[PDB]
From a paper:
Methionine adenosyltranferases ([name], [name], EC 2.5.1.6, [name]) catalyse the synthesis of S-adenosylmethionine (SAM) from adenosine triphosphate (ATP) and methionine. [name] is abundant in all three domains of life, and the cofactor SAM is essential for a variety of different enzymatic reactions. We describe the initial characterisation and the crystal structure of the [name] from the hyperthermophilic archaeon [name]. As described for other archaeal methionine adenosyltransferases the enzyme is a dimer in solution and shows high temperature stability.
Author numbering:
A (entry chain A), C (entry chain D), D (entry chain C): 4 to 405
B (entry chain B): 5 to 405
Amino acid sequence: KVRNIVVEELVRTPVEMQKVELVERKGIGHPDSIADGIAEAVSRALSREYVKRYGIILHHNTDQVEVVGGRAYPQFGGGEVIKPIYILLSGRAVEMVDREFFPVHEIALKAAKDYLRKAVRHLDLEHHVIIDSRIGQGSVDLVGVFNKAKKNPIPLANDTSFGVGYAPLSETEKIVLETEKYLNSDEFKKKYPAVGEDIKVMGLRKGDEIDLTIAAAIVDSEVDNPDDYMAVKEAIYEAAKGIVESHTERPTNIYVNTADDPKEGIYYITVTGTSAEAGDDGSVGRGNRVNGLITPNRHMSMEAAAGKNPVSHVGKIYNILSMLIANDIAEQVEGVEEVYVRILSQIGKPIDEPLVASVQIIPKKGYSIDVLQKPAYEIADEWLANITKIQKMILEDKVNVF
Amino acid sequence: VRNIVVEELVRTPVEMQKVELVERKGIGHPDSIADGIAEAVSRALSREYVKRYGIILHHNTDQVEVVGGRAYPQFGGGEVIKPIYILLSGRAVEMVDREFFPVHEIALKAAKDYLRKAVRHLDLEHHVIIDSRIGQGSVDLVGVFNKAKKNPIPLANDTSFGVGYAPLSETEKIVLETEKYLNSDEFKKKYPAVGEDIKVMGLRKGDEIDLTIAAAIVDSEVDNPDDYMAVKEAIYEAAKGIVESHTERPTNIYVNTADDPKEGIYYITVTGTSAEAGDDGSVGRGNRVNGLITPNRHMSMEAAAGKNPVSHVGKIYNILSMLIANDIAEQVEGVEEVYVRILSQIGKPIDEPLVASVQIIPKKGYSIDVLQKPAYEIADEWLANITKIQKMILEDKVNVF
Amino acid sequence: KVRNIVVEELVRTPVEMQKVELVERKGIGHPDSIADGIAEAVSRALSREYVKRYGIILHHNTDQVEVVGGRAYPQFGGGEVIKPIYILLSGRAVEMVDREFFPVHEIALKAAKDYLRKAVRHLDLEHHVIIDSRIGQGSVDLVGVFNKAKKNPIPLANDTSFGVGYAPLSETEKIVLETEKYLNSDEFKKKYPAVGEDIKVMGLRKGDEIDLTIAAAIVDSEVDNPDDYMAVKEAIYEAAKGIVESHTERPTNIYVNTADDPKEGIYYITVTGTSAEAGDDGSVGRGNRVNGLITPNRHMSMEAAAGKNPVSHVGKIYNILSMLIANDIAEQVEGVEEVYVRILSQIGKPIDEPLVASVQIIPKKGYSIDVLQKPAYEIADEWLANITKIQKMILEDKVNVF
Amino acid sequence: KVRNIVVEELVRTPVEMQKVELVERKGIGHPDSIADGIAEAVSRALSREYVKRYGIILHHNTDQVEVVGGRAYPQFGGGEVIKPIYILLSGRAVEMVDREFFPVHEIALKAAKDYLRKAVRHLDLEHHVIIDSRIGQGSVDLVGVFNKAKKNPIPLANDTSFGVGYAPLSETEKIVLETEKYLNSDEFKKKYPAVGEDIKVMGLRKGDEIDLTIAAAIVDSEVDNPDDYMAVKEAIYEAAKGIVESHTERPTNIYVNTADDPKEGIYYITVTGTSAEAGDDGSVGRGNRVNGLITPNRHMSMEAAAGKNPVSHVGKIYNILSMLIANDIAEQVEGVEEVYVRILSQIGKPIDEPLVASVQIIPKKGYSIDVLQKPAYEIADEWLANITKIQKMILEDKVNVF
């Protein structure tokens, strides 16, 4: 196919040289991220079962999840939950296949629980949380589905939407991403079971100076007094330092739980390891983009990838693809300092035929856009030709969407 | 004396970028219905707290789920089969000292009043269920006053961030003003078949623009396909008029591109919103505070809708950044483009940000030196008056989506 | 057909001669009665629309409705509701017919609202209540349904259950019944708009002495202070007095809102006219029997008639039928002092073929069971043959089920 | 210490000499019984923990439980649950005690799920059920509670409440009760794990002939084809015949799962062993009275005992009390053929001082009422003196309420 790809130079200062860079990440126990990961765990568990029974992922979109805050009162040595966290699953999934029922609600509720067990280790999943499903019923005749799939080997776009992604990551980006990932590793979680999964990380660079703030819920059953807690914070400090030192020679101030105040009793302790116990809410699409970050020095799509199907929904598929394409361009094409990729769907045309795939590149010093633009074009075109590979990448947990 | 830093922005302006992408979700789109309900509830609660106690009490209603119903649209008039379900959450104050405040009554009325105006053909009594899980809260009023008196200007406890720009490009204005006119009272009186679920996408490449409009058509206003086709024409003509007032670039306009007549497929609905079957919605998934979704620009992830207008730093800074950029673009001769970013200083009042970066591309022939001073000044005046935002919000004088 | 009717004498003292008789009625704004009423409104609205669309009532049972109490703060001149009443509709109904979707939830929610407007006049239906439906889905194919109607003209029984009814009503029962229906008549609500619909009426007769206690919610917006509130109770009192005098010669004490304690500022005032605003809950089947009363001197079925379908559910149909058989016997057969009727279904046989229809009679003095048994028998047999007349009686609002 | 207890002769034919008798029981895994059981489980759990923490039972009522049928696809060898059972807990309880907090929802959720794990053994509580809580809030001052308690050690009635019990049980009553109870016993479940807990038993006696019908959900993972199924029904038949033969010499037909139609492939087959799995619904107070039975030949209260406050809810206390008193008089006083006990509260007064406690005795042949009066009066007066023992019986699981 001749595809609508456009490669242009982007004239601005590269982000490493911009004076003020702000990067955020919401970790895996943060209420918005809990919603994202449930939304996605439901889509994937549904998708796997549809493939198991019928060979093919049937239509669904479970990109709507509300995390409604409970009430709890932590205390050194072990506080308690008073009102449970209430989670609602919605979106839509095929449940009537010909005349038979597919167990959408059973699958969805089990995936949600299974995902939470691993996202918030200290949450009692039977007594601190209620999870209900209001996932909409769709219907399909299976012969119609296969016929439509024979007619269009690359699925048709259902919506007019764009995805966006860029590469490579900056030092501040890499520090932020890796700091939350390290702190929420299974590995680290076995060394310090006081560290809850609700970790927000913020990285603010002014010039060559970086402030890295970590806000991390401590679990009160694992810390019997302010001193145990203070030792926990220090271990978070030392964690972060070795990530910071692996990533920059810039001088860096690290802060943990800045709101604390020993005098007035104030410490960031929680019964469960998420602030969703205390009345903070979450919902899908309010947090990390598909590269795992929130990055106002860069660009983004407002489409929420989590929970959307990986077969036809470009709000997931073109966010993923834009990141993959930007990444291969930054890595494979000498001369690229930065690259931003933006893809807009053409409703009723195949998802590999977008209205545009806009690639915008800042050359390294010395390089002309003219030598960059052919190899950038080819990478983008080849990924577009192979767009249906994102289905399996999703089924096999090979890419993240938040 | 504030950390405002006005410097030049050394970049090709957006108009000279080759590809520009801009989207707006109109008022009856399910994500915007969610955003709108959220902010409606916030504003309702706010006017009632002030009326009763002289002060806005803490709330945040930035959590609204729109779960799609079922419907069978039909030329001549269809029916709703299962009602739309909408959940209100977040939290607010219902105990003030020894008195009680009817949080849930205010929210249900504000939500249902907001939908009545947002989706004109939705039957509120029968096509919708609104459920509240708005969380509880308790306040001692005197203590609240004594914090307000201690700090007239609220203290940050955070590094929160806001970003805004001006002026709008051609393509931005076309997209914004196309949806607004299609959902205007004037237009609805002439063509009441045009529903409020209108999503508009603008793509520019060089000097060619493609504008696509997906507008839910109301099935009781359209007796058959020729009636429907005439409505699409009138959308097309209305957009063409707005396009021509904004640009000389050749522009193609496409309306309801998913339509497939020979298969019987038309964008008709019973109520005028896809929430009735085809779509779910939720808060902070659509338009930013300037009403647009703009991947060529820098955007914040903050969901402004429903956030506390008195102390939510992110809401207030996102609004402020937009107001400051606008005024600079409008007031200062020689501004081609301006971005404002504002970053709070934890502990310090919100009118003393860590930094307020104003970055300007001069129009040709102008130098940054003749722009610096008046820009600094405009930015300082607004920061000084940061508590003004709270009363713009109450008075319905600024939008958050 | 030959049916399993057994008529026998009941040897005991008639209720009018028993020493201690207790009767109770929950009026229409009482939370348990709001549940029954809503259950039955939903079933009737569904039934009416199945008939309109298809000729025939399709299967449903909406005999599950929870009224979950709100919170409110009444005060003279007008209080406020803080948390709304929350009402869940449950049960099941056919929603797919020939792959086509019938608007179960639209009909149910509207019927609930419509019933509540009427049942609690001062309740704000959009801001003081939330109504949600979890009514379960069923499916049918219409040819299948007509072929089965064809084949079984009297529908088959799906359960093994009994109904129970009796006649005639004692003085005490008539007073209790008529006292609540008068105080909740439209006529009287025009005359005294302060009187809420949550009226509980109890009649306790000891020998030839009756204590009639009324508990009636007063609506706080039509009563400006305690003296307006005392006038209203005196109007209630005087109403009851006329009903009492119309029905008995026994001396009778009448008490209205006995928990009132003016000295401590306690008065039964409400914002809406139902106690469901203040946290009293209701559910279906917890109150009045089909004859409108709770009568421990008599006998009853534990089946809840309200919301159950009137085509095949004997848990409704045998409670209605028993009342009707018992009433016609007591009225038409001279010499019947009392008659009690109990009917037990035979699962998978026609509803007019019960396992037993037991009739128990107390003769008037001088009359022998021997001359009562044949006409009692015939009345029962006739009504069993005419059992399907209960459908139209329900559709046309000719009988009450609470 | 002088109470208004009145012993008199009941001049009536005893129930064994009536021609028709009808007795039903809903067993443990039936949806109405699930609801009653969960209600009372949550109350007792709440109570034990209030006692633990504060040395007294704080106010609650959890007599409101809605069991909304799921979807299932039963099959010989092992079927599938398609959509979870949804259970709504309502009522109210105290979560604020002075400046402290009490975890009402965590105790209720755990007690409910624990109750179910016992009640329906093949139900998977993590995947086949959702338990939602709308239990209402409440606040107390603990010295306020103790002062009230110290002042009125026997709690004061606030209205006229009523309870009725009778004894002894008839042959048919004991057959119905013991049949369900043996079929749901540990012992029998061990030997025949194919027998689910959803068992409803109906006994009909006409004269000296009894028909006993047992409807028992059979679990499909335990039964590979219809001959294994039939063998299970045979085992049910035979365990019932044993119960029957030890209780009566009257000839008795036993019927098991009468709805079955092998020619058409219809068997009472389930995945979990309760009909709640497939759209059949349940709620509180729609089933057995506190003696475990539904007895239309008898006088019954409409009170829903399950989940009511065991310190101050008087209808609950008086229906328990009634039954225990009638029982003791039956068992201890030579000459009692049949005995009814009714207790009516005295509005102003402590509940051990009722308006009346009516004890009505049919003497066995040859015995005179006046040899029965005194021992009956003593037993009744002794229990009314010991009204607080019921509280402790409830908390120690030594009485049932359905």
